[PDB]
Write a protein that binds this ligand. Structure first.
Ligand code: HEM
Ligand code: HEM
Ligand code: HEM
Ligand code: HEM
Lengths: 141, 146, 146, 141
């Protein structure tokens, strides 16, 4: 589903994200917990307060994973397999929730990188995140 | 639907600063480019084959303003969403045949644009409220559907 | 929401023949097997790891009957969907946290089961009506949500 | 997204569909037009009356396509490319409509093959049709 141009767009956008991927990951989680309450369910063991260390530590792991995917874009299935088993088989995350996190991710990127988050780049990012989600819910399809 | 009163106050104070021409043009433009099947409904507008031509299309900019204007009538009438949009729900359903999924898509893009424009001022807690509003509008445009 | 009167009559006459135990057990079972993330909400029911163990699980059969019973209260109360399901909408949202997308999924599976059971008697025109009913129930269970 | 078991399930189910794939295709179209009115939009040039020759002829083409896919399940992207360009680029079909047709397809199969449409088989068919749809809307993602 990812064309050459999209891969170019995504690699470029993320380079601008740089060492902030972790911070964006955590903020995105926040915006999800606050805007879409149903998702707080997957995280009972977590302190969801508004500047908590778990979301922050979790935020880092998500950014790390997204960075990995950007460096593997041609074999996302191979690079994200540990992750696919976890989300689909153990945690049995409702697939709708991926759409929700994705939206919050784009929301965060827009806040911090307003000049770089052009229409072209937004479209490629959406495509990217749809593709990460599809792999993470493949034990479904 | 409501959501709170310290909340309605925060939503209203942001709209004060929303440039409906600028936000609406970009939001509609964003829509046409990320979700490209929505282009099907705007054929009379001419050239929408690429990002530069959409965002720069005068009809896109103008229709966008009209959309964000009605969004605004929504924000000032949260007590009666279902009444504010009734006429519009019939237009979109009976006449144009837009699947209501697309209302959600547009409301989400709207949120992303507000986020782009207002930056750190568009807090998580403030997005939370707007997610509610946008969901409200989308449900009200799906309603008196049949 | 309505839909017609020769229509309500056709819907009511089919329900006459619906075995809520049989249909409800299979419908819930179908749900748990096609969409497997819904299993997360039914952990107290024990073994749902494979098709044979779901369809044969007594708690699945029993809960299914309860679901199809309330569906039935829906079918006999189409004038007031939003009132019939209010209590249930609060249970599913405030308490269990089911995304409302799943109501649609279940209503669709319900339609497929009715189709399996009634065959050529479940006409396109009759499915049409039930698609309406099922959409009605799903919206009513999404409502007095917040 | 398609496992070995699913491929086995799908090949088997369709063999039971046999020479009826055409008829099921047409009926499925009917159930879509009637149950989900918004889809009538893509077909202005068509007589949508209830036993019309166009839907029937169109029904045949859809069944033919689904049969092809079953015989190509390991490279659906290659076998359905003409079709992907058409739906996504020319006709710009809203992707939601694929979900709707899919549901109507399963509805039809259930009506005519009640004994063969077991839970296991239903699940594999859903997966199959989700995969056909994803290819047919790939010029999107
Ligand atoms: C871009 C999409 C996503 C990515 C890339 C992603 C990635 C990850 C990664 C790498 C972990 C490892 C956590 C650890 O090692 O401790 C994780 C854990 C987890 N994720 Fe996701 N995730 C995504 C979406 C979601 C969604 C939508 C949900 C549900 C709302 C979710 C729920 C969880 C949960 C519950 C854990 C376990 C955390 C724990 O128990 O410590 N994830 N995720
Ligand atoms: C936030 C949700 C939306 C709102 C509030 C909205 C509002 C409006 C309004 C106010 C008009 C003009 C009404 C008039 O003055 O007569 C309009 C027209 C239109 N809208 Fe929507 N709209 C929304 C979403 C959508 C979506 C998702 C589509 C995609 C199909 C769409 C397609 C159209 C079309 C095709 C027109 C006619 C434009 C023309 O004159 O050619 N709208 N909309
Ligand atoms: C047609 C839509 C649905 C209807 C009409 C319905 C109806 C019901 C009813 C009547 C009850 C029991 C209420 C009571 O007696 O206290 C119930 C319980 C429940 N439902 Fe739903 N339901 C629907 C969809 C769903 C979906 C999609 C899920 C997926 C999460 C779900 C999950 C549950 C759970 C977990 C319970 C609690 C069962 C228990 O006691 O452990 N339901 N539902
Ligand atoms: C399983 C999913 C689908 C498959 C396999 C499929 C397959 C096909 C094929 C093979 C054709 C060739 C028609 C021809 O040669 O004349 C076609 C045409 C067409 N399809 Fe689909 N289709 C699917 C879903 C849809 C959906 C959801 C829509 C929109 C509701 C749609 C709308 C159309 C239209 C408008 C045409 C052109 C018909 C004409 O102009 O003669 N299709 N499709």
């Amino acid at each position: 589903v990812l064309s050459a141009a999209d891969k170019t767009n995504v690699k470029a956008a993320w380079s601008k994200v740089g060492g902030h991927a972790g911070e964006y990951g955590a903020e995105a989680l926040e915006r999800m917990f606050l805007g879409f309450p149903t998702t707080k369910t997957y995280f009972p063991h977590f302190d969801l307060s508004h500047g908590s260390a778990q979301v922050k530590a979790h935020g880092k792991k998500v950014g790390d994973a997204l960075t990995l995917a950007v460096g593997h874009l041609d074999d996302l299935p191979g690079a994200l397999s540990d992750l696919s088993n976890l989300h689909a088989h153990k945690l049995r995350v409702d697939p709708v929730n991926f759409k929700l996190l994705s939206h919050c991710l784009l929301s965060t990127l827009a806040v911090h990188l307003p000049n770089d988050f052009t229409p072209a780049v937004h479209a490629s990012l959406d495509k990217f995140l749809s593709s990460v989600s599809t792999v993470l819910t493949s034990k479904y399809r | 639907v409501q959501l709170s009163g310290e909340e309605k106050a925060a939503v209203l104070a942001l709209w004060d600063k929303v440039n409906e021409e600028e936000v609406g043009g970009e939001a509609l433009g964003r829509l046409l480019v990320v979700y490209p099947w929505t282009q099907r409904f705007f054929d009379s507008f001419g050239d929408l084959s690429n990002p530069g031509a959409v965002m720069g299309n005068p009809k896109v900019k103008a229709h966008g303003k009209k959309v964000l204007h009605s969004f605004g009538e929504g924000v000032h009438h949260l007590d009666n969403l279902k009444g504010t949009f009734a006429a519009l729900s019939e237009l979109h359903c009976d006449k144009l045949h837009v699947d209501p999924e697309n209302f959600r898509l547009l409301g989400n893009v709207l949120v992303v644009v507000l986020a782009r424009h207002f930056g750190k001022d568009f807090t998580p807690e403030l997005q939370a409220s707007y997610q509610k509003v946008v969901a409200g509008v989308a449900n009200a445009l799906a309603h008196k559907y049949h």
